[PDB]
Design a protein around this motif. Structure first.
Motif, PDB file in Angstrom:
ATOM      1  N   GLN A 198      46.640  42.149  34.992  1.00  0.00           N
ATOM      2  CA  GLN A 198      45.611  42.567  35.932  1.00  0.00           C
ATOM      3  C   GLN A 198      45.146  41.461  36.870  1.00  0.00           C
ATOM      4  N   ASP A 199      45.680  40.248  36.747  1.00  0.00           N
ATOM      5  CA  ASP A 199      45.301  39.159  37.633  1.00  0.00           C
ATOM      6  C   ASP A 199      46.355  38.065  37.538  1.00  0.00           C
ATOM      7  N   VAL A 200      46.700  37.484  38.685  1.00  0.00           N
ATOM      8  CA  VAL A 200      47.663  36.394  38.768  1.00  0.00           C
ATOM      9  C   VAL A 200      47.068  35.296  39.637  1.00  0.00           C
ATOM     10  N   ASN A 201      47.163  34.053  39.175  1.00  0.00           N
ATOM     11  CA  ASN A 201      46.659  32.889  39.895  1.00  0.00           C
ATOM     12  C   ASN A 201      47.706  31.785  39.915  1.00  0.00           C
ATOM     13  N   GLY A 202      48.945  32.157  40.217  1.00  0.00           N
ATOM     14  CA  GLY A 202      50.032  31.200  40.255  1.00  0.00           C
ATOM     15  C   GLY A 202      50.688  30.998  38.905  1.00  0.00           C
TER      16      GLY A 202
ATOM     17  N   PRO B 220      37.668  38.101  34.278  1.00  0.00           N
ATOM     18  CA  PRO B 220      37.642  37.590  35.656  1.00  0.00           C
ATOM     19  C   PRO B 220      36.236  37.343  36.177  1.00  0.00           C
ATOM     20  N   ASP B 221      36.144  36.936  37.442  1.00  0.00           N
ATOM     21  CA  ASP B 221      34.887  36.482  38.026  1.00  0.00           C
ATOM     22  C   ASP B 221      33.795  37.544  37.989  1.00  0.00           C
TER      23      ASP B 221
ATOM     24  N   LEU C  59      34.015  40.812  36.995  1.00  0.00           N
ATOM     25  CA  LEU C  59      34.035  41.826  35.946  1.00  0.00           C
ATOM     26  C   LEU C  59      32.865  41.637  34.987  1.00  0.00           C
TER      27      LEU C  59
ATOM     28  N   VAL D  95      29.879  43.149  36.790  1.00  0.00           N
ATOM     29  CA  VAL D  95      29.852  44.607  36.728  1.00  0.00           C
ATOM     30  C   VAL D  95      29.402  45.074  35.348  1.00  0.00           C
TER      31      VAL D  95
ATOM     32  N   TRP E 123      40.011  40.857  27.197  1.00  0.00           N
ATOM     33  CA  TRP E 123      40.972  40.150  28.026  1.00  0.00           C
ATOM     34  C   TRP E 123      41.527  38.943  27.284  1.00  0.00           C
TER      35      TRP E 123
ATOM     36  N   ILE F 274      53.430  36.243  44.591  1.00  0.00           N
ATOM     37  CA  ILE F 274      52.542  35.112  44.856  1.00  0.00           C
ATOM     38  C   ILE F 274      53.041  34.297  46.041  1.00  0.00           C
TER      39      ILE F 274
ATOM     40  N   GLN G 148      46.362  35.152  46.039  1.00  0.00           N
ATOM     41  CA  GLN G 148      45.849  35.822  44.857  1.00  0.00           C
ATOM     42  C   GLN G 148      46.257  37.286  44.880  1.00  0.00           C
ATOM     43  N   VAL G 149      46.554  37.821  43.699  1.00  0.00           N
ATOM     44  CA  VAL G 149      46.993  39.204  43.550  1.00  0.00           C
ATOM     45  C   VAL G 149      46.231  39.831  42.392  1.00  0.00           C
ATOM     46  N   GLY G 150      45.656  41.007  42.625  1.00  0.00           N
ATOM     47  CA  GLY G 150      44.982  41.732  41.568  1.00  0.00           C
ATOM     48  C   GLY G 150      43.474  41.766  41.696  1.00  0.00           C
ATOM     49  N   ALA G 151      42.781  41.761  40.553  1.00  0.00           N
ATOM     50  CA  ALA G 151      41.328  41.862  40.547  1.00  0.00           C
ATOM     51  C   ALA G 151      40.649  40.653  41.178  1.00  0.00           C
ATOM     52  N   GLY G 152      41.364  39.540  41.339  1.00  0.00           N
ATOM     53  CA  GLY G 152      40.765  38.366  41.947  1.00  0.00           C
ATOM     54  C   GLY G 152      40.582  38.473  43.446  1.00  0.00           C
TER      55      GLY G 152
ATOM     56  N   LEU H 118      34.592  46.852  42.907  1.00  0.00           N
ATOM     57  CA  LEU H 118      34.673  46.765  41.453  1.00  0.00           C
ATOM     58  C   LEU H 118      33.540  47.539  40.791  1.00  0.00           C
TER      59      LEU H 118
ATOM     60  N   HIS I 241      42.877  47.908  40.872  1.00  0.00           N
ATOM     61  CA  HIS I 241      43.154  46.551  41.340  1.00  0.00           C
ATOM     62  C   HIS I 241      44.460  46.592  42.128  1.00  0.00           C
TER      63      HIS I 241
END
Lengths: 93, 344, 92, 340, 335, 90
Positions: free
Chosen positions: A11-15, A69-70, A72, A75, A82, C42, C61-65, C72, C79
């Motif tokens: 659900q999230d990618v940061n490299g 995440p940031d 979430l 909310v 996670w 990415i 950045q990809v997704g919820a970020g 949200l 996402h």
């Protein structure tokens, strides 16, 4: 439906810092596969992310409210399912 | 100007591993040739069938020369179409100057010979057809895999039965198996159920009386609707429409093996589908030099989303190039082994 | 719509675009004349044509970020947003 | 009165809502006459046809059994051939039991291989009525016969039907697609409990495949070894589908020609009636009400079952009286009138 | 007796919210009198006129077929035409076939090129009755004639009609207009099953463009090759449109002068009657009831089928005609 | 009882003890042709492994199969010789 050895979805990618949401309904304990008892995502365990034909491997680095995440947390502050996975290597053809 | 085999193999492996995107197939006369039970293959090719008809049977040879005046070397389909046209005209026996009923006897003889030659069973469980059937059952895909065939035998059906593979060929019934046409377009079929379409017919087709209702079942003596298209005033039309409708699905992929692209209607339908849907992809697989396929190279130059694979040549994205012979995937058995390895 | 089409700009912050992936999901291949490119990777680049010249950018950045704040709260189950950072442009 | 019963039946069946199902016994071929003779006679007709075709077994069973039928004879023959040295009852050098089994099986398959007559068949009327209703709850049909007549007529009417077998001349026995039930609504289900005349077993394993009628060999009245299970299933899964239809909300059920002489069917219908009070059964009787003691006992026990006969009408576990529908051609005419 | 179904037809005409249409055969224009003579010759009259202008082929066809019609003769001529060396079958020098077909086409062209008479034509009354109804359900009429009399009648009252073609002297065939079927309810639709002398093909490709009648070439009785991936000379599109109109919610439809002598039409009519249970066909019979065996068989097989004749009437599968009379009845019912 | 077994609304505390081969307190009284459980009589028993009576055995087998279909089910066998055929196939 979903085959065995299933944990969740990305659900999230940061490299090089993946975040995964556990899709297991409940009973995060001893998901039996091939007659052997493996445990749901743990700090020292590995995970596998198959992309079409090659499998990406990773290692769990954080479990709980840290991996959320940031916004979430903003909310909802009571949801913690996670994990944070860091990629290590890949298996080719 | 130079292409790498491994890149295309990896691309195909990634493609087949997908589940939601619809998949299909085309099985031509060149697929059974790659499987041999005796020293010769269990089923001959189109040229072999034409040669067998020619040397197995001066008046008879007149028709072959008569058709050759306006067309190249006649084949089985051309001869059968000419016989059908001759039977359409009542007093058509003056062209051959041989009575007015010998045409029917010749048609019965050739139909019986073809049925005898084609009604063969595939031996052994190691046939590529069984491998494909097992591969179909491996992954529970969201959309089932359709199969189109232009052959006359029933090898695919027997292979599907052997490995317990449910399917539906547009025929429902136990004794007569009448053609149901509303359920085809309604298309609320079981998700796990596959589909198989025989574009040129097989030995199990029989034509009824003046009712003319088509049915399938046990083949009968002196009756075989193995006619490719014949004529009418029909299952063939709805099958073509089904193929065209499938080709319009989003991100649809169609794979051809053993097909020489000699036909004209099929090529026109494929070109229309490729032009209509910009996301479809077709894998043209050959087992010869690309210089033999003029129509295929013309279509690959005209269309951009067509990929061709030959022994020593390949056309990708309107740009003909050379390999880094190669591309051992052209053979049907190698394709089945690749599919089995992908499933495992 | 024409091929080589991904989504639609729905935010701008000077040099940080936020883009929405469209409804035709599950595909994740987007074949373009043969080879197909995975959507929203990415390291991939994107192109935003404005009239006559094109703007290029690199995904970060990809997704919820990448999704903004209010969406949200509206729905946490969606996402499909990416964060594109501008790099340069192609002239006439 | 009879008229009120007919009106109620018309306005509960003709209404589109609850699922519909029929049971067809061996009495249905009796009601159709071809060349002043029945197309297929009753069970007794086949029995004395076999008799006129070695009475020792017949009087051996007659000592403890009343007037027998073919199914009992073939079951006894099968029980004999299970035992290796089974000839001590009848001479030695076991060949009669086998030879009898084949002789009777192809004799029956020759007697039953009959073609349906022209468009006046009541089966055509039933098929037309089936095509006349497009309700979501499809109609499943259970039959105890052996012939292909019903599905022949249905195919002549150009309608779809699924009978648990999928494929071609060597179609296997589809098992799972029975109980995912993921089938089109327009499709209908046909189940034959006692078997067909084209099913054939296999040497490698119990395949009970359906296809072209095998030469001489056929499968009738499945009663062989069932320890393996899964394979050679159709009998058990047929009763299972019957039980599932008996349960669930289904305020409709029709019977035609059933003699209530099957222990494996009477028990399951009684269990379903006890478990499902909302469901109703409209069992009929083409005879006098006194010929069916088991049906009378079942009607007395379960109130949901409704039994009607020529003599009187048993309604609500109570005997009634009159002051027409037994005929199957009349039943087809009534169905056509309701549809039209 | 007759008053029963007369009142029934009046009531169902007064029943709106359901589509209406009609089928025009060769009998309706034949029964129309121009200068004490039929406006359009019948099939027998047309065959006699053709014979008035090489009977070996006719004699050969008579061996296996009874007294034929123009359609069979032209189909046989074309079938010989596709065969290259078909001249040896009937004499030699297969050039008489082209001249014969050209002459037959010319003769038919000036035979059917007849202008519609004045305001006394019942076609005008039918058009006025159709236009006087403001029902949302548009009326689509299919005919079998080779003329354009109904086109002139509809254009004489400024009534919107669409025949599947639009444009100019080289008007093309719009294919997907039938596909989406998105037209205003005020407009009407027309289809010619066998076509008129207006349609003509093209040498470069099978385009069957509609326009000013070209000299020499005319398209009639579409039965040519269908291997061009449709759109060559499709009567199949008209058949599909008929099937779709039979597939919409059930309505009672009528016909005028149909002899039930078209196997292709009969098959699709039976299929539509079987698919739609309440579908009703009000085809009449301006002749002896025993002269229509196919109609009687269809009425017996299909209960919903309704047949009426001069001497009897088959209603409910049990036995028991003028176009001007029908037009007058419709006009009276409208008021 | 046959309704309460298959409707399966029982207290969570209550356990279940299915006998796949019957016991010595099972007796068939014939007459009404109904199976009942009571005091252990002399001679009358229902020892049958499978029998061929015109059945509880199929009910218990179906119960076992239904239990094996539950998500994450565990079944421990002690003292079983596996010589039986029906149980092994199930």
């Amino acid at each position: 439906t979903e085959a065995s050895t299933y944990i969740g979805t990305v659900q999230d990618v940061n490299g090089a810092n993946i975040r995964v949401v556990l899709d297991i309904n409940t009973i995060s304990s001893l998901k039996f596969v091939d007659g052997q008892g493996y445990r749901i995502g743990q700090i020292g365990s590995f995970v596998r992310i198959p992309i079409g034909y090659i499998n990406l491997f990773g290692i769990v680095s954080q479990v709980g409210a840290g991996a959320v995440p940031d916004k979430l947390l903003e909310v909802e502050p009571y949801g913690h399912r996670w994990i944070s996975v860091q990629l290590v290597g890949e298996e080719g053809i | 100007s130079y292409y790498d085999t491994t890149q295309q193999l990896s691309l195909l492996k990634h493609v087949l591993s997908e589940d939601k995107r619809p998949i299909a197939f085309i099985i031509a006369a060149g697929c059974p040739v790659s499987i041999r039970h005796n020293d010769a293959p269990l089923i001959p090719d189109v040229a072999g069938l034409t040669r067998k008809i020619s040397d197995s049977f001066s008046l008879l040879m007149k028709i072959i020369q008569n058709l050759k005046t306006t067309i190249p070397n006649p084949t089985i389909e051309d001869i059968l179409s000419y016989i059908r046209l001759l039977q359409q005209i009542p007093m058509s026996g003056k062209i051959h100057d041989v009575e007015n009923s010998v045409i029917n006897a010749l048609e019965e003889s050739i139909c019986e010979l073809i049925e005898e030659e084609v009604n063969v069973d595939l031996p052994g469980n190691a046939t590529p057809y069984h491998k494909i059937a097992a591969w179909i059952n491996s992954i529970n895909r969201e959309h089932q895999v359709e199969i189109f065939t232009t052959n006359y035998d029933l090898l695919m059906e027997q292979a599907l039965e052997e490995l317990n593979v449910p399917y539906f060929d547009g025929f429902v019934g136990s004794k007569r198996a009448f053609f149901d046409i509303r359920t085809i377009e309604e298309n609320k079929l079981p998700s796990r159920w596959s589909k198989l379409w025989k574009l040129h017919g097989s030995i199990n087709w029989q034509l009824d009386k003046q009712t003319q209702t088509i049915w399938r079942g046990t083949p009968s003596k002196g009756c075989s609707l193995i006619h490719p298209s014949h004529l009418k005033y029909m299952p063939y039309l709805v099958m073509m429409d089904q193929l065209k409708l499938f080709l319009n699905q989003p991100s649809a992929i169609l794979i051809t093996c053993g097909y020489s692209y000699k036909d004209q209607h099929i090529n026109e339908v494929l070109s229309q589908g490729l032009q209509t849907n910009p996301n479809a992809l077709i894998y043209g697989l050959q087992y010869d030099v690309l210089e033999n396929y003029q129509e295929a190279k013309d279509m690959a130059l005209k269309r951009s989303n067509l990929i061709l694979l030959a022994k020593d040549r390949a056309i990708i994205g309107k740009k003909e190039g050379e390999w880094k012979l190669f591309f051992k995937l052209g053979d049907f058995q190698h394709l089945a082994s690749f599919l089995e390895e992908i499933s495992q």
